[PDB]
Design a protein around this ligand. Structure first.
Ligand SMILES: CCCCCCCCCCCCCCCCCC(=O)O[C@@H](COC(=O)CCCCCCCCCCCCCCC)COP(=O)(O)OC[C@H](O)CO
Ligand SMILES: CCCCCCCCCCCCCCCCCC(=O)O[C@@H](COC(=O)CCCCCCCCCCCCCCC)COP(=O)(O)OC[C@H](O)CO
Ligand SMILES: CCCCCCCCCCCCCCCCCC(=O)O[C@@H](COC(=O)CCCCCCCCCCCCCCC)COP(=O)(O)OC[C@H](O)CO
Ligand SMILES: CCCCCCCCCCCCCCCCCC(=O)O[C@@H](COC(=O)CCCCCCCCCCCCCCC)COP(=O)(O)OC[C@H](O)CO
Ligand SMILES: [Cu+2]
Ligand SMILES: [Cu+2]
Ligand SMILES: [Cu+2]
Ligand SMILES: [Cu+2]
Lengths: 235, 213, 244, 244, 214, 212
C-alpha cells in the first residue's frame, strides 16, 4: 500500500507494469488463484536504484493472508533471485492459495537488491472460510506428505521448552541454596568460600555431564529420524 | 512502622502490564484494517491520534515526576535513621522493579514486534503503528521511570544525595542515546551493588556475620 | 530485636522479599539490554528458519550471543559467587524471543512458528557457567568456556532444525522444507537475495562447513568474552562522581 | 600598592590588557583548529552552493559542526562560567571562511560569492550556549542543546539558500539556479558526479527529506557532543609530566 | 619597572600581517601568469625560488630561536620574584598571541585558499603556488613560533622550567603530525592558558584576589 | 653448590633442535610424494598419523608438566635463601631460553614455511603437511613450554609465587589467542622482573661496587 509515499519519478522510470490480472477476486481458504502480468525494465535506469541484476518477485500482501505456492518470471520458476536486463520485458505469475478470511489488497511486487521494493498494481481479494481449515500440503522426496501449516512445530517446542525449564531450574536452584543478599555479604566479608565449595562443584560437574549427554542423545536421535537432509538451497 | 510496604510496586506493575495489554490488544484490532494505509483518514483517527497524544503527555509526566520529587526531597537527608533508610532503599528497589518491567516491554516486546510488522508492510512513513508504540511510547515510558528512580534515590538516600552515582547516571541518561542506531545500559549492575552496600552497612555486625551467616 | 528491624522475622522476611525483587528486576533488565543488542546485530538469522544456514548463522550467533553472557557472569560471579551468569542472560533472551515470536510474529501477523522460532542457547550457556564454577577463573572460562560455547551451538540446535532440512522437489528444483516455508508464507520485505547464508565457494574442501564455522565461532568468542567480561566489571562500577 | 603591582592602576590595567590578549589568542587558535578539521571533513558541502542539498549537507555539517563547539564550551564554561563557548567557535569558523571565500575564492580566483558562501551556524551555536547557561549542565546540553542545534540548521540557512532554489528551464531540462551557478562558473576539478547530494531512493516516503535529516543530525550530534565535551576537558589538562 | 611592555608583540604582529600581506598580494600577481604551468621556466624564477629559500631559512630560524632561548635561559629560575614572574607570564601571553595569529594564517587563510586553487588547475606537481605557501611556509612559520613560546616558558618560568607542561608539549609537537592527513588537533592551548591562569591567581595576593577583583 | 648448572637447558635445546630437524628432514622426504593428495591413503599413513598422535600427546605433556610442577612446588617459598633464589632464577632463565628457541621454530620457521607450501598446492583440506606441523605441532609445543616456565616461576620464586606477573600471564596465555588471525612481547616485562630480583640479590657490594 506504500506506493503513494514513494518518489514519483522512480516509480515511473523503473518497472513499467502491464496486463496485470487476478485469476479471481474472491476465494475460499485453501482455494488457489493466480496473480499474473508483464513488466518492462525502463531503458534509462535511475542512478538511485541499483542495476536490477539481482531482483526478487513477490506478492505485495499484508503477511501470509494468501500462501504463495509457486511463482514464475522470465519463463522460470523463481523461488530465488533473478536478473532483469534493462530494456527487456518479462512476464510473471504467482500462484496464491487463500489462508486468512478478510478483504486484502494484493499487489505484484519486485524488489531490487541495490534499491528496494517496487510495487505493482494491487487488487482487493476477498477470502472466505476459517483459518482453522487451512492446510498445505507438500510432498517430500521420500514420497510422504506433510502439512506445512503445522509441520515440525511440535518437535521445536519439545526441544525448546524442556531446555528453558532446565535453565530456570538451575537459576532457581542457586538462588535458593544461597541467597542474593547472603551471598553478596559473604563474598564482601571475605568468604566467598562459604558460598561455593565442592560439592557445589560436584553438582555443577554432574549437571554438565547430564547436559552434554542429553545433547549427544538428542543429536543422535534426530539423526535417526531424518537421516537424509540437504543444506538450504540458495543463489 | 513497615520497612517493606510494596503497595506502590503493585500499583505500578498492575497499571503497566494492564496498560500495555490494552495497547497490544488494541493493535491486534486496529493494526489490521486501520494501520496499513498511512494515507487513509482512518490512520489519522486510530494511530496518529496516539502519536499526538502520548508525546506531549509523556514530556509532562517526565518533568512532573521530576519536579515533584525534587520538591518533596528530604531537606535534611543525613539525619535519616537506619530504619527509615532501610525503608527508602526498599522503595528504591520497588522503583527499579517497575523499571525492569518497563525495559522488558519497551526493549524486548515492542522492539522485536516491529521486526514482524516490517514483514507486513512496505511503509508509507516512519510513523507506522509499531513505531508509534515502540519509539514514541514504550521507550519514553521506561525513560520516565528511569528518571523517577534516579531522583527518588537522589532525594531520599544520602549516598545518592551527594555526588552522582555513575551507574545510575548512565542508567537514566543512557535511554536518550538509544535513539541513535535504529553502548548498552547494563548500568543497573552498579546501582544494585550500590543498594547492596547500604544494606550491608545498615545491617549490624550482628544481622550480618551472625544472623544471615 | 535487630535494628533497624524490630524482630528476627522482620529481618529475614525483608531479606527474602528484597532477594526476589532483585532477581526479577535484574532478570529483565539484562533481557531488555540483551534482546535489543542481539536483535540489532544477530538479527535476522534468529528470526527466520530460512537463514539458519551452515556458515553465517553458527558464526554470528555464538559470537554475538556470548556478549551479555560474559557481562552477566562478570556480575553474578565476582560479586555473589553465584554460578548462573550465562544462563541468567541466555534464558532471559530465549523467553523474550519466544514470547514475541508467539504473541506477535504469530499471534499478530500469522507467521508459522516453524518460520520464526529462535536459536537455541541454553546448552552452550550451561557449559559456560559450569566452566566458571569448576575452574574458578574467567581466564579459563574465556578459553575453554567460550570454545565449548561455540562448538555446542549447532549440535544443541540440530534437533530443532533437522526436520526442516528434509528435501522436497518443487517445479523440478530441489528445496529444503525450510526454504519452502520461507517461500510460502510471504514476507513483504524479505527477498531471497538478502539472506546472507552460505552460497558455496571455490575454497570449501569438504563436507567441513559446519565444524569449521563451529570452531571459528568458538575461537572468536574467546576475544569477545574477554572484552565483555571486563565491560561487565565497568558496568558494575560503584564510582560516585561530583558534577554534571 | 598591591605587589607585584606598584599601584591599583597597574594591577587593574595589567588584568585588562591580559584579558584582551587571552580572548584574541584563544579566538584563533580555536578558529585555526576548527577550520582545518571542518574543512577537511565537512568540506566541500560548505564550499559550493550546488552541494547544499536536502540530505547530505544538513547531516554532515551539524554533526561535524558541533565538535569544536562542544570542546569550546568544555573550556569556557567549566573554568570561567562564561556562556559563549559554542558562539566563540561557530563565529570564529564563519569569519575564517568568509574572509577566505571573499579574499580568495573570489578575490583570487573569481568565483561569485553565490557559488561559495558558507553554511550558517550562529543561530544553532546560540541555542547550544543558552541551553548551557539556563540548565547549568553539559548532560542536558548534550541532549536538548545538540538536538536544537541539529533541528535549527536548515531553518537558519533557508533565508540564504532559497533564492537559488528557484526553477529555470535550460535546453528542455529543469535546473535550480544553484545547479546553474555551479554549471556556469567552471571549476577544473568538480565533476557533477562527485557531489554527494540526495539523488532519490525507493525508501523516501514524502516529502520528509529535510525533517528526517534534521532529526538524524540532532540525535547523532548528541553523541559527538559528549565525546567532544570530554575532549575539551582532556585538552584543558594542566598535567605536568617529567620526561620525553 | 613595567610588568606589561607589548612592544615585542606589536613588532611580531606587524612583522607578520605585513609579511603575509606581501605574500598574498604577490600571489595575486604571480599566481595568474607565472604559477599555472609548472613546466615553464617562469615557474622556477617566481615559485620554486620561494620553496628553495624558505625551507632552509625556516630550519635555521627554528634552531636559531631555540638555541638562543636556551642560552639566555634564567640559570637560577626559582629565585624569580613575583613582579619578575608576572612580567615573564605577560611576555609568554605575548608569544602566544603571535602564535594565535600565525595559526590563523597557516591553518585558516592559506589552507582554505588551496581549496580554490585546486579548482583553477589540474596540477603539474605538488609544489603548486598554494602548497609552496601553505605547507612549506605558513605552516613551518607557525611551527617555529610554537617552539619559541614553548622555550620561552621553559627557560623563564619555574612552573614550565621543571617537568614539561603536557598541553604545551602537544602544542609545540602537534605541528609535526599535521603533515599526515593529507594524505588529532592541537587545542592544547586550552591547558597552557589554564596553566598561565593558575600562576596569575597565585601571584596576586589573597588581597588582589578575593578582595580587589572580587 | 652451583648457581649455574645449564645441563637442563642443553638437554632441552638439543632435544628440540634435533626433533625439529628430524621433522624438517622428514617433510623434505614425505612432503613430495605423500603430502600432495590428501585423498590418497598414503596421506593417512604419513601425515594424518602425526596429527592424531601429537594433539593428545601434547595435551598430556602440557597437563603433566603443569601438575608435576605444582606438586613439587616449594611449600615454604619465602624461606628461600639468596643463593637458592639466585639458582632458581638462573633455572628460570633456562626455561626462557628454551621458550625462545621454541618460539623461533613455531612462529618463524614453520610459520613462514607454510607461505611456500601454499604456492605448491591448491589444498584438499586444512590439514596439509605444513599445517599439521605449524598449527598442530610447533605451536602447541612452544605453548607447553611457556606454561612450564610460568609454573616454574610460580612454584619456585616468591615474587612469582604470590600474585600473577601480568607479563608472564600474557606470555603464557597469549599463545591460546594466536589461533585467531595482539602480540606476546610480554617477555620484556618478565625479564625486567627477573632483573629486579637479581639486582636485589646482589648486595650493595656486588652492585654499586663490583660490577660498578
Ligand atoms: C537538580 C534537579 C532539580 C530539577 C527538578 C526536576 C526533577 C527531576 C525528576 C525527579 C523524580 C524523582 C522520583 C523519586 C521520589 C519517589 C516519591 C514517590 O512518589 O513514591 C512514593 C512511594 O514509592 C513507591 O512505592 C514506588 C514503587 C515503584 C513504582 C513507582 C512508579 C510507578 C509508575 C507506574 C507506571 C505509570 C506510568 C508513568 C510514566 C508515564 C513515596 O515514597 P516516600 O518514601 O518518599 O514517602 C512515603 C510517605 O510519603 C512518607 O510516609
Ligand atoms: C626571530 C626569528 C629567529 C631568528 C634566527 C635566530 C636568532 C634568534 C633570535 C632570538 C630573538 C627572539 C626573541 C627572544 C628574546 C627574549 C624573549 C623575548 O622575546 O621577550 C622579550 C620581550 O618580549 C617580547 O616581545 C616577546 C616576543 C613577542 C612574540 C613575537 C615572536 C617574534 C615574531 C617572529 C616573526 C618571524 C616571522 C617574520 C616574517 C618572515 C623579553 O626578553 P626576556 O624577558 O626573556 O629577557 C630575560 C632574559 O633572561 C635575559 O637574557
Ligand atoms: C615407561 C615410560 C613412561 C614415561 C613417563 C613420562 C611421562 C611424561 C609426564 C610429564 C612429567 C613432567 C616432568 C618435567 C620436569 C621438569 C624439571 C624441572 O622443573 O627443572 C629442573 C631443571 O630445569 C632446567 O633447567 C630445564 C630448562 C629447559 C626446560 C626444557 C623443557 C623440555 C624441552 C623439550 C620439549 C618437548 C619436545 C622434545 C622432543 C619430543 C629444576 O628443578 P628444581 O630447581 O625445582 O629442582 C631442584 C633440584 O633438583 C635441586 O637443586
Ligand atoms: C583442544 C583445545 C585445548 C585447549 C587447552 C588449553 C588449556 C590452557 C588454559 C590457559 C590457562 C593457562 C595458565 C593459567 C594460569 C595458571 C593457573 C594457576 O594460577 O596455578 C594454580 C595452581 O593449580 C594448578 O593449576 C595445578 C596445575 C594443573 C592444572 C593445569 C592448568 C594449566 C593449563 C596447562 C595445560 C597446557 C596444555 C597445552 C597443550 C595444547 C595456582 O594455585 P593457587 O592460586 O592456589 O596458588 C596461589 C598463588 O600462588 C597466589 O595467587
Ligand atoms: Cu495495496
Ligand atoms: Cu522499525
Ligand atoms: Cu593541495
Ligand atoms: Cu595455511
Amino acid at each position: 500500500h506504500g506506493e503513494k509515499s514513494q518518489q514519483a519519478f522512480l516509480r515511473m522510470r523503473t518497472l513499467n507494469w502491464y496486463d496485470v490480472q487476478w485469476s479471481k477476486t474472491t476465494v475460499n481458504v485453501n482455494e488457489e488463484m493466480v496473480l499474473s502480468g508483464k513488466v518492462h525494465v525502463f531503458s534509462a535506469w535511475p542512478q538511485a536504484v541499483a542495476n536490477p541484476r539481482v531482483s526478487f518477485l513477490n506478492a505485495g500482501e499484508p503477511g501470509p493472508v494468501l500462501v504463495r505456492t509457486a511463482q514464475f518470471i522470465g519463463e522460470q520458476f523463481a523461488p530465488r533471485s533473478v536478473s532483469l536486463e534493462i530494456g527487456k520485458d518479462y512476464a510473471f505469475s504467482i500462484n496464491l492459495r487463500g489462508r486468512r478470511a478478510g478483504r486484502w489488497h494484493v499487489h505484484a511486487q519486485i524488489n531490487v537488491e541495490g534499491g528496494g521494493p517496487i510495487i505493482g498494481p494491487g487488487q482487493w481479494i476477498e477470502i472466505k472460510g476459517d483459518m482453522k481449515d487451512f492446510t498445505d500440503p507438500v510432498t517430500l522426496l521420500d514420497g510422504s506428505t506433510v502439512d506445512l501449516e503445522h509441520y515440525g512445530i511440535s518437535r521445536v517446542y519439545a526441544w525448546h521448552l524442556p531446555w528453558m525449564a532446565v535453565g530456570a531450574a538451575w537459576i532457581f536452584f542457586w538462588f535458593v541454596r544461597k541467597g542474593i543478599i547472603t551471598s553478596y555479604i559473604r563474598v564482601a566479608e571475605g568468604k566467598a568460600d562459604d558460598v561455593i565449595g565442592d560439592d557445589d562443584r560436584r553438582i555443577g560437574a554432574i549437571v554438565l555431564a547430564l547436559t552434554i549427554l542429553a545433547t549427544i542423545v538428542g543429536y543422535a536421535v534426530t539423526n535417526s529420524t531424518f537421516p537424509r537432509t540437504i543444506p538450504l538451497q540458495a543463489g | 512502622e513497615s520497612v517493606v510496604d510494596l503497595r506502590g510496586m503493585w500499583i505500578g506493575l498492575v497499571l503497566l502490564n494492564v496498560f500495555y495489554l490494552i495497547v497490544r490488544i488494541y493493535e491486534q484490532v486496529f493494526g489490521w484494517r486501520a494501520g496499513l494505509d498511512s494515507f487513509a483518514p482512518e490512520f489519522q483517527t486510530y494511530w496518529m491520534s496516539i502519536l499526538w497524544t502520548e508525546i506531549p503527555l509523556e514530556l509532562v509526566s517526565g518533568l512532573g515526576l521530576a519536579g515533584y520529587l525534587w520538591k518533596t526531597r528530604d531537606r535534611n537527608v543525613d539525619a535519616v535513621t537506619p530504619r527509615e533508610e532501610m525503608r527508602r532503599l526498599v522503595v528504591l528497589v520497588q522503583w527499579l522493579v517497575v523499571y525492569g518491567i518497563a525495559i522488558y516491554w519497551g526493549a524486548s516486546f515492542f522492539t522485536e514486534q516491529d521486526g514482524t510488522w516490517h514483514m507486513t508492510v512496505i511503509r508509507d512513513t516512519d510513523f507506522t503503528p509499531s513505531h508509534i508504540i515502540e519509539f514514541y511510547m514504550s521507550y519514553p515510558i521506561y525513560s520516565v521511570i528511569a528518571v523517577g528512580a534516579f531522583f527518588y534515590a537522589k532525594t531520599r538516600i544520602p549516598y545518592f544525595a551527594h555526588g552522582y552515582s555513575l551507574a545510575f547516571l548512565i542508567v537514566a541518561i543512557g535511554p536518550f542515546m538509544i535513539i541513535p542506531n535504529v553502548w548498552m545500559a547494563l548500568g543497573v549492575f552498579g546501582v544494585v551493588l550500590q543498594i547492596l552496600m547500604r544494606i550491608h552497612a545498615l545491617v549490624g555486625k550482628e544481622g550480618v556475620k551472625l544472623l544471615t551467616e | 530485636a535487630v535494628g533497624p528491624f524490630n524482630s528476627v522475622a522482620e529481618a529475614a522476611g525483608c531479606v527474602q522479599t528484597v532477594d526476589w525483587m532483585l532477581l526479577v528486576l535484574l532478570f529483565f533488565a539484562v533481557l531488555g539490554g540483551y534482546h535489543v543488542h542481539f536483535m540489532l546485530t544477530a538479527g535476522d538469522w534468529d528470526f527466520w528458519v530460512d537463514w539458519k544456514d551452515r556458515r553465517m548463522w553458527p558464526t554470528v550467533v555464538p559470537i554475538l550471543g556470548v556478549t551479555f553472557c560474559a557481562a552477566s557472569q562478570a556480575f553474578w560471579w565476582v560479586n555473589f559467587r553465584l554460578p548462573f551468569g550465562a544462563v541468567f542472560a541466555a534464558l532471559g533472551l530465549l523467553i523474550g524471543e519466544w514470547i514475541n515470536r508467539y504473541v506477535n510474529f504469530w499471534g499478530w501477523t500469522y507467521f508459522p512458528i516453524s518460520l520464526v522460532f529462535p536459536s537455541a542457547l541454553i546448552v552452550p550457556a550451561i557449559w559456560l557457567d559450569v566452566i566458571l564454577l569448576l575452574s574458578g577463573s574467567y581466564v579459563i572460562t574465556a578459553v575453554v568456556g567460550s570454545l565449548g560455547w561455540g562448538l555446542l551451538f549447532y549440535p544443541n540446535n540440530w534437533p530443532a532444525i533437522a526436520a526442516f532440512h528434509q528435501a522436497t522437489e518443487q517445479h523440478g528444483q530441489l528445496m529444503t522444507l525450510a526454504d519452502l516455508i520461507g517461500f510460502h508464507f510471504v514476507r513483504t520485505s524479505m527477498p531471497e537475495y538478502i539472506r546472507m547464508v552460505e552460497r558455496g565457494t571455490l575454497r570449501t574442501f569438504g563436507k567441513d562447513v559446519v565444524p569449521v564455522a563451529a570452531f571459528f565461532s568458538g575461537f572468536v568468542s574467546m576475544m569477545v568474552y574477554f572484552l565483555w567480561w571486563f565491560m561487565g566489571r565497568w558496568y558494575s562500577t560503584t564510582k560516585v562522581i561530583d558534577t554534571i
